């Protein structure tokens, strides 16, 4: 048994105009995280993690995420394959992820050198999950970019308790 806020229609999710795949590369901090499986946990607050985007020769991304868990750095690797339009991706080698039938990435907005908002949607065990990440080139962003991210998350049907601001750390992500 699982009850989820429904994924929004893709029509409610803007695409960054004239996306530049080369400028999106490098390290992003996860400064904000919202979604239908994200819950605030005042007990054990979510620690910031980082995601590195590297363009391969075929223009897919190697996407490496690093998080600090159980006193160690945990790495996870994804391939993002260019999809229907610049700034949209599907997941490479979906067969290797048990239960995963669908995975979509849309870059909603970025200025490449400070911030980005990225929409993800997937179907895993026939359940439809979506999330939005607010990416920072640094571990802090303005109140203005954070409130913009809260506004965008709420427009997609998420309440406040499905919106978190991971806490800055130094381990693994520097
Ligand atoms: Ac995922």
Swiss-Prot record:
This is Neutrophil gelatinase-associated lipocalin. Monomer. Homodimer; disulfide-linked. Heterodimer; disulfide-linked with MMP9. Gene3D superfamilies: 2.40.128.20. Detected in neutrophils (at protein level). Expressed in bone marrow and in tissues that are prone to exposure to microorganism. High expression is found in bone marrow as well as in uterus, prostate, salivary gland, stomach, appendix, colon, trachea and lung. Expressed in the medullary tubules of the kidney. Not found in the small intestine or peripheral blood leukocytes. It comes from the Eukaryota. Its main location: secreted. The gene is LCN2. It is found in: Secreted; Cytoplasmic granule lumen; Cytoplasmic vesicle lumen. Pfam families: Lipocalin. InterPro entries: Calycin, LCN2/LCN12, Lipocalin, Lipocalin_CS, Lipocln_cytosolic_FA-bd_dom. Enterobactin binds at residues 103, 131. Induction: Expression is activated by the oncoprotein BCR-ABL; BCR-ABL misregulates expression via the JAK/STAT pathway and binding of STAT5A to the promoter. Induced by insulin. Glycans are attached at residue 62. A carboxymycobactin binds at residues 49-51, 122, 131, 135. One of its GO terms (molecular function) is identical protein binding. GO terms for cellular component: extracellular exosome; extracellular region; extracellular space; specific granule lumen. GO terms for biological process: acute-phase response; cellular response to amyloid-beta; cellular response to hydrogen peroxide; cellular response to hypoxia; cellular response to increased oxygen levels; cellular response to interleukin-1; cellular response to interleukin-6; cellular response to lipopolysaccharide. Iron-trafficking protein involved in multiple processes such as apoptosis, innate immunity and renal development. Binds iron through association with 2,3-dihydroxybenzoic acid (2,3-DHBA), a siderophore that shares structural similarities with bacterial enterobactin, and delivers or removes iron from the cell, depending on the context. Iron-bound form (holo-24p3) is internalized following binding to the SLC22A17 (24p3R) receptor, leading to release of iron and subsequent increase of intracellular iron concentration. Keywords: Apoptosis, Cytoplasmic vesicle, Disulfide bond, Glycoprotein, Immunity, Innate immunity, Ion transport, Iron, Iron transport, Pyrrolidone carboxylic acid, Secreted, Signal, Transport. Belongs to the calycin superfamily. Lipocalin family. Disulfide bonds join 73-172.
């Amino acid at each position: 048994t699982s009850d989820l806020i429904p994924a929004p229609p893709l029509s409610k999710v803007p695409l960054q105009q004239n996306f530049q795949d080369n400028q999106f590369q490098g390290k992003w901090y996860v400064v904000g995280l919202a979604g239908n499986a994200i819950l605030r946990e005042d007990k054990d607050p979510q620690k910031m993690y980082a995601t590195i985007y590297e363009l391969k020769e075929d223009k897919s991304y190697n996407v490496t995420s690093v998080l600090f868990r159980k006193k160690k750095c945990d790495y996870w690797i994804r391939t993002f394959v260019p999809g229907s339009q610049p700034g949209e991706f599907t997941l490479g080698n979906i067969k290797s992820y048990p239960g995963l039938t669908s995975y979509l990435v849309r870059v909603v907005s970025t200025n490449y050198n400070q911030h980005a908002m990225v929409f993800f949607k997937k179907v895993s065990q026939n359940r439809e999950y979506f999330k939005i990440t607010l990416y920072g080139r640094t571990k802090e962003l303005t109140s203005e970019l954070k409130e913009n991210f809260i506004r965008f998350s709420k427009s997609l049907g998420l309440p406040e308790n499905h919106i978190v601001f991971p806490v800055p750390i130094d381990q693994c992500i520097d």
